[PDB]
Design a protein around this ligand. Structure first.
Ligand SMILES: NC(=O)C1=CN([C@@H]2O[C@H](COP(=O)(O)OP(=O)(O)OC[C@H]3O[C@@H](n4cnc5c(N)ncnc54)[C@H](OP(=O)(O)O)[C@@H]3O)[C@@H](O)[C@H]2O)C=CC1
Ligand SMILES: NC(=O)C1=CN([C@@H]2O[C@H](COP(=O)(O)OP(=O)(O)OC[C@H]3O[C@@H](n4cnc5c(N)ncnc54)[C@H](OP(=O)(O)O)[C@@H]3O)[C@@H](O)[C@H]2O)C=CC1
Ligand SMILES: NC(=O)C1=CN([C@@H]2O[C@H](COP(=O)(O)OP(=O)(O)OC[C@H]3O[C@@H](n4cnc5c(N)ncnc54)[C@H](OP(=O)(O)O)[C@@H]3O)[C@@H](O)[C@H]2O)C=CC1
Ligand SMILES: NC(=O)C1=CN([C@@H]2O[C@H](COP(=O)(O)OP(=O)(O)OC[C@H]3O[C@@H](n4cnc5c(N)ncnc54)[C@H](OP(=O)(O)O)[C@@H]3O)[C@@H](O)[C@H]2O)C=CC1
Ligand SMILES: N[C@@H](CCO)C(=O)O
Ligand SMILES: N[C@@H](CCO)C(=O)O
Ligand SMILES: N[C@@H](CCO)C(=O)O
Ligand SMILES: N[C@@H](CCO)C(=O)O
Ligand code: NA
Ligand code: NA
Ligand code: NA
Ligand code: NA
Lengths: 331, 331, 331, 331
């Protein structure tokens, strides 16, 4: 039996849910041979209302180098980056839900990802299997990937189909805790693009640049546009696509007209749909946002780590696209 | 005594400071023969402790068309846009501190800015005179403009100069209420770019596009880089520049090496430095972030309105630069 | 027109309600010739959730000597005492709701009360008239005073009569914000005894010591005891009494059996009942606790101050009791 | 593996720390063949952010009779009393940190303390050994006992020694979670008196009355008085004393002048100093307040229980003192 010393970065909706999940499931952890011991939780207001004991809160950065694991769910890029890099350099693993960090600081983080030190299941579709799903998909070669990777805009478009307005729906989405701190990252496709980039690096090209993703959000959409779609037997969704074009991988995020009976149009939550050779057509769906959904993901990764498995590795080498089949109907 | 009927969008750091400033200054408003009456205040969560009366809180959008003024401080782009457009179409002015909205939705908002319906002093350097400063500078032809327009990143480089880390500094700026909800906007230079764009449009080209601003943040800077700069007699700052290159106006944001005696280097708050012909060299500095600082700007604009003056107008035409220029050296 | 510079000590349930009441009614204040300007609000957590703008919060003591008025609703004794004494010494008035302070630090505070610098209507029965009521009663000489001066125990006894348990009722009372920080002061009669002492000093003896009050709370009471009372046509209440005994004023707090139709048994809230010569029998009733009720009181006192009236003066000299008539049925 | 069924009364600083400590230490409990199961957690406000699961929160009293243990950390006297008595009558132990309850309701609780049903290590000096320390000291006959038993007022005098004010110091102690809800209990010596009483009953007289303790606080002390003490080679501390006078045990709390080299003067945490025959001179010091410190005590007692040991017993008889004594000089 040994102590698992955990440094937690961020004590918000995700951080808190993870804290409490780890202690609630400490009996599970003991079957893995460990007892969880939080060293501290980095936050901004150590004295306010929060679902973590006050004395564990740290309003200032603390030394991470005696941790066994760093868990991060701070949001942003450069600040978490500078906090996690010394831990990574010392060979301490990172479990993160922070898709922006990974997408936008890959030059610094890729070498540690390659050594199996970064676990990030929660960074795409929360604790819905996404990275694991593509790890198994690597048995086959991708032909096309399409996902609904942002819960806030899904929620908004579902509410707008029901005639509610953009602004009403966004407000609710923020209350449910789905939105990023700034909702612009959700509604302009950027959060989807961060996620798509991580999927591409796992499956098809370990150097895939976030900047190459062409992203457009849901700003031209209205309840009227959606009702007109429905009348054509279609649904409009924000879709994140990965596909070959003239010999290269291309990544896009955009609203798309889908047949109403397509798995992506129907799915209950976030969804990733793939066609691959030789497996065929596979998809996964579940909640893509929220405290508890994300904590599930982070805790999945902690069990992954504890069982002796490495983190999520980039593709070992860029793979050749098989199909030039750039699909699509935009809106 | 007539009602001045205000719809307030947002009840956060800025909206609350504003609401309370209005109440405290109600005497001053009686000097124009009005009494301020808030029709409602749009917020996400009517449950939080808030220095605004429960009964005025709205969790859902409310009709704006009986207002004499819409004051907006909700954040984002598309949602505030869709909420203010109907009021603007009806000839109701908007008072806003929302630089992202103005910068990113100018195709929709420009026509109403041109009619005098948009007041936005608080959108750049908060209640420190910036737009008014430039309105006066229109008496001359611009040669070059350089500003320190992001309060959060000034604060960070000032704190880093004294040896503090990035992460600490950032954390403290968030606590002071200076950071955008997404701090990445501050630290990658995007918020400065938003502000830069609005200065360009006011002064030299009413269609200047936000996408034309070239912007790079402070992510390569450490307490070491800045302390080496001090020993060369320099200060490093993030500077927003508008200057002539090849007969076109160029707009850039980047860390620059300043002589340490330069007004921009010696500024403790945000700062705007202009050279124009025939005035010469003029400079303004003051706080560029914070609830009260921002509320001052919004209230300055409410007084501007009530006095009979129109909003902030874009430049009446585009014109090329008079002289070829250049910013300071990068880092 | 002039500025009324206010230092507020405490930003809790009372402090916040008062802050917001002062700004909401600033138009009333302008008819008195003033505009309210808070210098700062002393609290413990300046960053947490609260119904006062964050920037006005002060987590540490601040200089009060440029205030025109100090308002205190911090709770406790020695800490507020040490904060207000320099202001009192400088001739700056105090408006307080803090009955413990006044009862237990009267040696230090009496000389300032005598000079008319202390306004404390809110310290007994909140903004229900109590001190003003006894100021008018001074036309007559007291024969007996009985009050129901603690809202928490009233609420508990009313709930217990309805069969709810002590512990259920207390919990609700704490949620409604009626209880002191420690409920022991409520349930053992001490808070009632603090209040009774202040009443005695106004009306009958300016040196009346808090230590001479004989106080016993509601700890022997149960729903059964109360139901047995009801069956006898009685109600049990915690009653605060002032009456002459062998030539001296005596003060007690204790549960008493009252006829069910007595004003004290019926009253809607806190109640003060007096028999006096020659006026006869007078009473007053209303809410004795709560944020808004207390803020009413403090704001009444601010208007009192602004109109040129002095604070609540102690009796100029101990008055001779007329009746030896020690009344009573205990329980 | 059997359920250890715990009813927790209180979910605040202490109850939360305890709840989370139990979860984190669940492995350790499997070594006694139990798994901890909380039947419910009594709280005032189920809405606050709290590191305890929503579904276990109870806003109203719940049946305790299926519990193996009641752990209480709700504060006050009468309400916890009425809630724990039925459990105690049913032979369910109580683990408590509530010194006021024990001190003030001993007529009801003594019989159950005598049967081994009450564990209260955390009631004096938190999880620092105090009751266990005295249980060992029963091997000798007490000559005299002197302790620094109030964490808040030590903290205040330590901070005042360094020039800080009372009010500042107090504010900081409240923030650290050291102060009773009513800080007056701390600063007028009453909390030390509560603790003193429990030490007397454990050691020398199982009926010692709380009302017999003579108690005076720190209200006459300033940074000036303490700095003058330093120059005489002395430290002033609030000291709780039990000593023989005229053949009876006397218990007092008061500021005392200590030689600066005395163990009591050099203690950074709370401290208990005893002279007994034939042991000699023994001393214990450690943290006497705080959530985690207190939770350690409660959990120590839960382990004591689970090992088969009974609670803390009162002294098996009263006995007179062996020697006439005397505390240090007052201030
Ligand atoms: N919400 C969701 O549905 C999901 C979010 N994510 C990701 O998880 C991460 C966190 O999201 P979420 O929990 O919702 O965000 P929250 O704002 O709820 O949490 C952020 C936490 O980080 C602390 N913090 C943030 N910045 C700093 C800083 N500069 N210095 C010190 N402490 C800081 C905050 O302190 P404080 O509380 O004091 O302000 C807070 O405790 C983000 O990367 C987001 O993209 C992933 C999946 C789902
Ligand atoms: N802070 C500063 O220094 C400055 C900020 N600004 C700008 O002013 C604006 C507001 O900033 P600040 O007050 O700091 O932001 P805050 O997040 O503190 O306030 C945002 C406010 O808007 C409400 N809100 C947020 N999103 C929505 C939505 N989609 N629908 C309805 N209500 C919403 C919130 O409700 P709730 O409180 O329930 O969460 C909150 O009251 C921003 O554009 C910012 O860039 C400008 C100058 C200075
Ligand atoms: N509740 C009621 O019904 C009534 C109460 N009163 C009296 O009014 C007073 C306040 O009561 P209430 O508002 O309910 O109490 P609250 O705890 O709600 O408010 C106390 C306020 O004082 C601040 N504070 C307290 N102690 C300190 C300290 N040592 N240093 C710095 N700041 C401090 C608190 O800060 P923070 O919020 O950060 O903790 C808080 O803002 C008390 O005297 C009470 O007896 C009178 C009539 C009615
Ligand atoms: N803090 C310390 O250093 C120490 C404290 N103690 C003692 O431990 C006990 C608890 O202290 P602490 O946790 O600091 O106090 P807190 O006020 O922080 O916690 C009190 C808890 O009990 C709940 N509560 C309070 N009153 C009632 C009531 N009448 N009915 C039901 N629930 C109630 C509250 O609910 P909610 O959270 O909804 O408000 C809260 O969860 C006290 O007896 C204190 O003297 C002992 C040693 C150290
Ligand atoms: N804002 C994100 C959170 C999940 O990563 C979303 O809506 O999907
Ligand atoms: N985050 C912004 C707000 C002020 O516009 C800044 O730092 O300047
Ligand atoms: N606890 C007090 C507040 C009013 O002063 C009461 O219950 O009356
Ligand atoms: N307020 C108490 C709590 C610890 O029992 C103290 O300061 O000691
Ligand atoms: Na996932
Ligand atoms: Na400005
Ligand atoms: Na009153
Ligand atoms: Na102890």
């Amino acid at each position: 039996m040994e102590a698992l010393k955990i440094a937690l970065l961020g004590g918000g909706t995700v951080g808190s849910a993870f804290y409490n999940l780890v202690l609630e499931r400490a009996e599970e952890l003991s079957a893995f041979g460990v007892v969880p011991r939080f060293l501290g939780v980095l936050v901004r207001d150590p004295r306010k209302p929060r679902a973590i004991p006050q004395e564990l809160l740290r309003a200032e950065p603390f030394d991470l180098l005696e941790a066994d694991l760093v868990v991060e769910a701070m949001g942003g890029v450069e600040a978490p980056l500078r906090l996690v890099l010394p831990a990574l350099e010392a060979g301490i693993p990172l479990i993160t839900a922070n898709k922006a960090l990974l997408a936008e600081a890959w030059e610094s983080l890729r070498p540690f990802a390659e050594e199996g030190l970064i676990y990030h299941e929660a960074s795409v579709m929360a604790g819905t299997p996404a990275l694991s799903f593509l790890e198994t998909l690597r048995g086959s070669e991708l032909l096309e990937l399409h996902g609904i990777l942002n819960g806030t805009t899904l929620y908004i478009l579902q509410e707008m189909e029901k005639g509610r307005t953009y602004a009403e729906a966004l407000l609710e989405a923020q209350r449910l805790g789905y939105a990023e701190a700034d909702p612009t990252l959700d509604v302009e496709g950027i959060d989807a693009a961060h996620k798509l980039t991580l999927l591409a690096r796992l499956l098809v090209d370990p150097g895939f640049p976030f900047a190459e993703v062409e992203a457009q959000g849901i700003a031209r959409l209205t309840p009227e546009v959606l009702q007109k779609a429905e009348a054509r037997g279609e649904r409009v969704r924000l879709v994140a696509s990965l596909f070959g074009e003239g010999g290269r991988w291309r990544a896009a995020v955009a609203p798309r007209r889908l047949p109403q009976d397509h798995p992506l149009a129907r799915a209950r939550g976030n969804a990733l749909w793939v066609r691959a050779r030789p497996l065929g057509e596979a998809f996964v769906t579940g909640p893509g946002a929220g405290g508890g959904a994300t904590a599930s993901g982070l805790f999945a990764d902690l069990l992954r780590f504890l069982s002796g498995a490495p983190g999520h590795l980039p593709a070992p080498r860029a793979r050749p696209p098989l199909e030039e089949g750039s699909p699509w109907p935009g809106v």
